[PDB]
Amino acid sequence: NNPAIKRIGNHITKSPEDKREYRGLELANGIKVLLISDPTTDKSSAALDVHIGSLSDPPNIAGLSHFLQHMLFLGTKKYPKENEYSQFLSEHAGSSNAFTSGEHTNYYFDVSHEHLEGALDRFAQFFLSPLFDESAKDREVNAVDSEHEKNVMNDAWRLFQLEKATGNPKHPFSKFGTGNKYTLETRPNQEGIDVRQELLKFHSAYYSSNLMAVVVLGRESLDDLTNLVVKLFSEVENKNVPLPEFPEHPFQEEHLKQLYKIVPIKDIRNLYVTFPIPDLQKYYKSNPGHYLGHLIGHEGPGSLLSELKSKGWVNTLVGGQKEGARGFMFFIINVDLTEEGLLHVEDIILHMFQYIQKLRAEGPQEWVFQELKDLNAVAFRFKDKERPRGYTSKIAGILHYYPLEEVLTAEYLLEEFRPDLIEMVLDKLRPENVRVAIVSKSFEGKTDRTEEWYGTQYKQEAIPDEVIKKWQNADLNGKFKLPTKNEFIPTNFEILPLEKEATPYPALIKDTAMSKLWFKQDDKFFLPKANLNFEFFSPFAYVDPLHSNMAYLYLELLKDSLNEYAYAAELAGLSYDLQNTIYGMYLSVKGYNDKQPILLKKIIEKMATFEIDEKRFEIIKEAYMRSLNNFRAEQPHQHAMYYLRLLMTEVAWTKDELKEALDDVTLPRLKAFIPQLLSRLHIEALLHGNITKQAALGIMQMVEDTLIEHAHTKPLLPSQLVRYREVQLPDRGWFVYQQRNEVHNNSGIEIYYQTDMQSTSENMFLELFAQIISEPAFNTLRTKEQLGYIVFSGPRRANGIQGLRFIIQSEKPPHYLESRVEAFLITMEKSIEDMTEEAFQKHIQALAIRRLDKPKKLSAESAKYWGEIISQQYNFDRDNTEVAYLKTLTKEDIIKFYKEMLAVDAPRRHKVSVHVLAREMDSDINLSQAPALPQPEVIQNMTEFKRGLPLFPLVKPHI
């Protein structure tokens, strides 16, 4: 009926549990579209994906597709204002982003459901009439340069690019996609290159509709969205641009049978094994790479990892298919290395080849495939509802590779068993086709080459033919066996009827000296899943640095020992997490409820009757020592946040204290620790999901009985159940703690204005001021003043106390940052004074909607409940109570609050700043007038600082 529509796709295959409605169609200009109708959604979204990226970049400008990614969303003929799209989405509780890959430039946003047409109209105009405003040319270069400079000191980005540089330089795969100040400014200036004209050349030659895909999600019907997208996207130019393909592999003979020795930033030992393979995409209905990745990357009994671990060579492994570009892919086998693993690289690889050879001897297995196909079927069926912004962005890219009807089922379903394709792929995984890379600090001052884009230090060798022959002739290994029938595969998906005694919030169904049990039966999602949360309290887990180290190692060793068993459950959508806390231990079991008690039983049984293997203990003790030293390689803002937590909490063991006390951790001392730690405990739990009241009680009893029987567990005294207090800062006080980051040449800062103890009134005073200043903070400090890559503002909540926080990572000294934040606070006071009641009520309403936002998955609901339980505040109806009080708030109340608590001259001001210096550092112009800042009290000793100040009380519970 409509000439603007080429074809309306048939039924879009979806999960029976999916209530969202789908319509697929192709427009006359060649745009592939998917319309998502969700009358339930709080946020409406859209995405456009151009099948052009950084592999198409011109030789003259490296990072041009990525620079276009920035320059395209700056002004349009309909909306000449550069920041229109950004402002509209900010004004209507939205957000936007984009990314550039080698073959795609994806653009996306979300907005309040009532404003889809307005946001989409602004979005569509960039694909119709862009202007590329010459005024933002230099700031975008700096935004792209800031992105790369952040990546430069990242080990993964370094490796990613070093791999690209060690392939065929004549191949597009070797291109540097990010760009920088050099590639976008310095170099084009020297060569008399017109950056804007080269950008427009690129835009006009590649950005065509035939290579585009659109996804629109909203409350509006399928037909209303069909009209909206036709109106907005049938006018987009169709220059019939051919799809860029790369059939030739960037890895030719001279790039095979090669060995690379790389120097990292962090003290990490890793082995990377790669095989170039053809492009397997077209075989998505059988997916041979997934079959082989499942087996090679298996962690159960008889796996390659198991043997490599037993040999004491590796702890972790990753195996499978890795995307390349249209025409090529890679097969990887990635492992970490123990000190002995680094010495037995050749041996490890021999074992890798022995496992690959076992699969050849055994041949493909239909039963392994049946499990994989059946599991993905259950996965797709009971899958959680997606965040619309990520959902659209994802589908936009997927539309290019699959028929309209298969874009939901694409990466989930398996149909045909193709053992011939498995045999085809497995045949490329051979020693004459291997590329080997070792990453070790031991290569420092022993390297001859440099990757210039990042500065990575490496050496390259050709692998001796005698090493290749040993891998080819590799003898059989009986330790390697194919996995067994996965008994963890779920079968019972019955949604237990909603009980007569069912409550809207978690109810305390057990209250004893040993345990406090909070339970809720899911009354919203109705998926066969549940979340089991346990917090085990012991004063012996943080009494001193030694015991803290021992509580860490205990649980690392426990997860390691349970790994081979737990893996099968993980594959069957049942996962667990076990971490030590500053009060004891945390256990979470998520996923399908069916086989959930079995894994829980095993976890607690292992906990209570743990037999430590000396070899594992020594390997894990070494890796934890490295992990301690590796904190220095973390970013300055991350360090700043770590120092404030130390400073502000009553008891807190530093990384320096923990590593000093690690040497004293012996195997008998640890063997003595476990019964002592488990001798006396309090357990506080939350069991939420597809469970009944009597089932939750039986779970808790099983947990109790296992600890009582095997560990001889007894409860703790209520006087022993004590939490740490926050430091109480003095009125009109300002303290500064300074430290240096030795890895990065940027500064870090956290500015904390401590207000008072949390309450309905105090929370909403702070949250309203935070709501008001939120967007301006980013546009001022980040966009206008260009302070740093990281600019953050919001409430800080710790130990029942709260306040206002500012986190910034800049190239400018922390003391300059101090004066800028202070000027901004004055501007915000002016803004609140000057703003209208209409603009003020919009803030109260924006915050109110965010706080009343319904959780969209069970885990999101449980996380809200868990927060109230771990804070011991138990205010499950918080949002309603606090939103009712917020609506009564006046402009003058926030002005008074600022005047008394936050202002430079406020009578009750409590400012504490943490300054993290850059690697090389030492300690008008139409900008806001910064006030006069007093002399800070410089903190020299964390203990003396705490000893000289009072500590706050602890917040009283609701229940």
Place this chain on the structure above:
Amino acid sequence: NPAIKRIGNHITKSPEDKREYRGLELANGIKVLLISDPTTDKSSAALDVHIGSLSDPPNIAGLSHFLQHMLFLGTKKYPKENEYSQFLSEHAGSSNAFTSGEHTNYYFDVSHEHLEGALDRFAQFFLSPLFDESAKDREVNAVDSEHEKNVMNDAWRLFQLEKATGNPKHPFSKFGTGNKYTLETRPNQEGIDVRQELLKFHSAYYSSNLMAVVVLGRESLDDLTNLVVKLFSEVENKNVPLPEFPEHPFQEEHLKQLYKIVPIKDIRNLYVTFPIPDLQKYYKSNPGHYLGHLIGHEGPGSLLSELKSKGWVNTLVGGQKEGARGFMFFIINVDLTEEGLLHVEDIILHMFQYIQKLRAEGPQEWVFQELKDLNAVAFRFKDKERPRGYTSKIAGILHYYPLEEVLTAEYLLEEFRPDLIEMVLDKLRPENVRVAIVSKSFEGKTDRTEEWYGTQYKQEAIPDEVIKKWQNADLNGKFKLPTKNEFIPTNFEILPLEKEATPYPALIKDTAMSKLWFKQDDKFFLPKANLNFEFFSPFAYVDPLHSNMAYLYLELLKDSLNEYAYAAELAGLSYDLQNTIYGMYLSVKGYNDKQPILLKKIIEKMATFEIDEKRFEIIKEAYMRSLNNFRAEQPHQHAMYYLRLLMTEVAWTKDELKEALDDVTLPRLKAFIPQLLSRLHIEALLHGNITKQAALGIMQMVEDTLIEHAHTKPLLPSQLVRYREVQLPDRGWFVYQQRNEVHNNSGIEIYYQTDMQSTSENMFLELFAQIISEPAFNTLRTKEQLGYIVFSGPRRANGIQGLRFIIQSEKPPHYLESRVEAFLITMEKSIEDMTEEAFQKHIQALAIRRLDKPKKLSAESAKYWGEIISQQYNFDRDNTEVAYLKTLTKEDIIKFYKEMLAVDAPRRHKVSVHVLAREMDSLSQAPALPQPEVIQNMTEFKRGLPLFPLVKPHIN
């Protein structure tokens, strides 16, 4: 001049004693000792009448005690009753008195400038006392108060019960305290005028010939002679023959008798007594001291060692017990285990076996010689005594020894008399034994009740078969005589005062492992040193279990080291070792000579200690009963104990500790000790006859002994955390209520928390406490008659302070609250009205008290140790704080009360603890009080309030 009957020869003193002495007998028969000490801060005098309670008329019990109370209540020269106490209060003085069975000792101290003034008031009570009728009823309520206090005390209960089981016609059977019944109720019923009987007794017994006067002053011996003659030569001589009681109060019918007594506390004791002749005459030889030393010995081969080894007894006390002139006793008292209580006959057999070993081996001259040598050293290097107690003690012993031997008397032994040792030993036989067993296992199984205390007991005759068994006691090979004591000091060298010596302790070491404070003694010059150590460990108080483990570890350590340590303790080298809320405390005191040997053994034992399973179980049981036994402590103590739990950050209760005790196993304790000693911090004070280098060597030795045997590493500074005081809110009032199940008396503690300690805050509080001190006693105790215990003063804990009131009364706690509140108003008025002259008198009185210089090393060390344990280190505090006190005004104090303590103060921080009586249900105008916040749960109360900072240390 002729008023002196004779002047004694040289008064034998120590060459180390710089004080001058003069003895003389007055014409009226008064024996006198004069002490000339120009350096003395306080001067003192004491008069002792050799007549006591054993002289009371049978129809008026406690009359001698009553005369003591009525004597110092006005005279002809000084008619007002308040005169004497008032005079001493105005001139930095004090006074007290005690009545025993044979003596009435009256004594005082005053400023060294006001000796003549004070002694003149004192002297009149021995010339023309008035005995004011106004105080008759108040003094009876005072004597009745003292007896009612002792009524629930197990030691006073036994003391009287023993006296109720002998010859009733013997003066020893007398109740010497008296009460409202014996001094008021019964005499009125019998038509006895107590006043005339009081005057009768005083006339008959208060004779100068039975009196001894001791005077200590800055004044010369010649000037002291003139003063004591001027005042005491007029005391009338009634020529009273000194009473004697040579019959033994236990005649044949009272021998071979078994007594079964019910206690208040869950205690188990065995008392074995032998009536003996009055050995006082043999004081130069002293055979009772000899046998006491051997029978009571705690070293290898001793009676105790075997009784411990068998698992029957933990402790033993042996030797002569004083009776009166004419009779004495020889005792062997032990405590019992659950098993000792079932093996009493076996314990006494073992006692008799040991006695027989002393017979078979005969007397040892070297044993006597060692005692002689030890008393010579102990007399020579005797610490300087506070004048008040020094005069009091001499006034008593003046009666017993010649003038010249009054100081050496209780010390020096001369001739070895094996004949006497055989004579005394011949009395230690089963035919002459008396046995008493104290145990709750007798509750409901007794027939008699002691009338004065209500003590429940049974009397039995020891069977002839049991006596015969004990008589036939074999020789036991387990008993061996003690060996030569290798702890006897020989090196008495006083090291020269170093060029770099300091007046206060100096920080001579500040490492991660230890903080060492040192001071060479520049005051006393006796061959002694005090070695104090604080060991910090987060594992000594992490939970109630570790706390019990810390207690038991040191108790077992002290137990195991006892046989070795006793020899040192006899040789004047004692030690203390106890668990703290932060770790452990060790103190080594006495003669420096053998001091590092003992300290090396204690530190070695700490680390290489091996636990005996039998002792562990025994000590564990002893500690479980000790926790329970707290229920029998006074209600005011209970009230003090609860406020320490309420106001401290972390504090494990007696209930939590006793609940944790069953989890203390032997493998658990063995795992704990290596763990506790693994990481330590030591804070020490080494004060005495030592050099800087000697101190450093001592600290290094302690550190190295721990490093070697325990692999000790230092803690992190971040781990050296001290508990905080709960910060009370402004205008707040919290009440905590409990009950005392044992006592029918109420206990209370009222705390007005002020602020953190600082020069200004300390002196505000201390000056306010000075002003209200006597009035609090006079109003609430004397006038209102609230109770025996009425206390007011500053409270100091965790760098914080405030005002406190402690009252033990039979009246309910809420009443005391309003009466204390009424008193606060009364003082608010009293301060506004008092003169500048009256105000300055309070400043001077506090200044004098605060500047009162220590008389011995121990007292100086204690002052320094207090500065160390608080982590304030303000050694020059007393000078600084007094200088500031002298700048304070009546206005400054008025401001402080109105802001912090007044019923309507803006910053009033009140917390009260109420401990009700056993039976209890759950005048100036008192102000209106708000409704208090009742503390249900101690932890929730603590969680709901903030915590104070910790006081900043005073740096050099």
